[PDB]
Design an enzyme around this catalytic site. Structure first.
Site, short mmCIF file in Angstrom:
data_model
loop_
_atom_site.label_atom_id
_atom_site.label_comp_id
_atom_site.label_asym_id
_atom_site.label_seq_id
_atom_site.Cartn_x
_atom_site.Cartn_y
_atom_site.Cartn_z
N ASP A 89 42.23 53.55 44.16
CA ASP A 89 40.90 53.00 44.34
C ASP A 89 40.91 51.97 45.46
OD1 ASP A 89 39.14 50.38 43.36
OD2 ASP A 89 38.02 52.26 43.24
N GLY A 110 43.75 30.30 43.77
CA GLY A 110 43.65 30.78 42.40
C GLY A 110 42.39 31.57 42.14
N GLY A 122 39.75 34.92 44.32
CA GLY A 122 39.36 35.63 45.52
C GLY A 122 39.71 37.10 45.49
N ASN A 123 39.75 37.72 46.66
CA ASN A 123 40.16 39.11 46.78
C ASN A 123 41.67 39.22 46.69
OD1 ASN A 123 38.99 41.97 47.73
ND2 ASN A 123 37.37 40.44 47.89
N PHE A 124 42.33 38.07 46.62
CA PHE A 124 43.79 38.00 46.53
C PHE A 124 44.27 37.47 45.18
CE2 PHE A 124 43.50 38.85 51.02
CZ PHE A 124 44.69 39.44 51.38
N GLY A 125 43.43 37.62 44.16
CA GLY A 125 43.74 37.14 42.81
C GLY A 125 44.20 35.70 42.83
N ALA A 139 47.20 33.32 43.99
CA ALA A 139 48.25 33.54 44.98
C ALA A 139 48.71 32.28 45.70
CB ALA A 139 47.78 34.57 46.00
#
Ligand SMILES: [Cl-]
Length: 275
Positions: A129, A17, A19-22, A24
């Protein structure tokens, strides 16, 4: 989150919940035995074209240094977007555990960085981006660089980006790549005066005047020192370009030889999700 699904093809690893992975869900795909991250979008009207656009765009990226797309799956609760997960942690995380990389190690990553950025450039229609300040690594002896092209500090911003109204995003990216290279070689951001780095005026100030200083204790070949100087040029028309970088003496040394789901099936899954 959404109740586990296709238990039968994927083994639930854990529910993250942040990180760079939102937010997940990590899963292991039983066949091919490999970690995968799953994102979830609510079935409601939240399934607009924007989401469709991003899914497709990400579905077209097929490069070893890019976070490849995997598959969409429909659950009654939500649309599941499955993609490859970079276990390795962040590049920046590895840099500061090591203090700083050797020149040869930095080249090893920079070569991947530039190859992956070059590919994204040849596939960019709007110039997304890349968020190059936060590239990841997979997991293995020689960790592989992974760029996160998803959608669902001042140091990385080129002088033009703030400076001028219309600015080429591809040239701005080369600057960002420069900053990443400096960081790998030096262990600190390119324009963050020591005395008081936390500062802002001072840092923006340095950027605009291109005042950077490779410290005494850091030793690097002059070919490397040249490349860096060609990247950190304030005027964009004069900044070295990706094709030229790929032809630079420093970049060529040790350059390795190297450097799905149906479009319909996917479209058919997104529609349903709209309900
Ligand atoms: Cl070293």
């Amino acid at each position: 989150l959404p109740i586990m699904h296709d238990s039968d093809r994927y083994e639930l690893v854990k529910d993250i919940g942040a990180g760079n992975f939102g937010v997940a869900r990590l899963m292991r795909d039983k066949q091919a035995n490999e970690l995968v991250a799953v994102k979830y979008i609510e079935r409601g009207e939240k399934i607009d074209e924007n989401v469709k656009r991003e899914i497709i765009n990400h579905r077209s990226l097929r490069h070893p240094n890019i976070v490849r797309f995997k598959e969409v799956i429909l659950t009654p609760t939500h649309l599941a977007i499955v993609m490859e997960y970079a276990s390795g942690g962040e590049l920046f995380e590895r840099i500061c555990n090591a203090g700083r990389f050797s020149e040869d190690e930095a080249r090893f990553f920079f070569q991947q960085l530039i190859s992956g950025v070059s590919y994204a450039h040849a596939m960019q229609v709007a110039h997304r981006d890349l968020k190059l300040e936060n590239t990841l690594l997979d997991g293995s002896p020689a960790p592989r660089l992974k760029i996160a092209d998803f959608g669902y500090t001042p140091a990385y911003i080129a002088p033009e980006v703030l400076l001028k109204k219309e600015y080429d995003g591809k040239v701005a990216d080369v600057w960002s790549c420069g900053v990443t290279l400096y960081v790998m070689l030096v262990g600190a951001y390119p324009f963050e005066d020591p005395e008081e780095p936390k500062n802002f005026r001072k840092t923006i100030h340095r950027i605009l005047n291109v005042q950077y200083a490779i410290p005494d204790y850091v030793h690097i070949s002059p070919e490397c020192r040249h490349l860096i100087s060609r990247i950190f040029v304030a005027d964009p028309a004069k900044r070295i370009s990706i094709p030229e970088i790929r032809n630079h003496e420093w970049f060529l040394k040790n350059l390795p030889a190297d450097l799905g789901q149906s479009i319909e099936e996917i479209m058919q899954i997104i529609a349903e999700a709209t309900v």
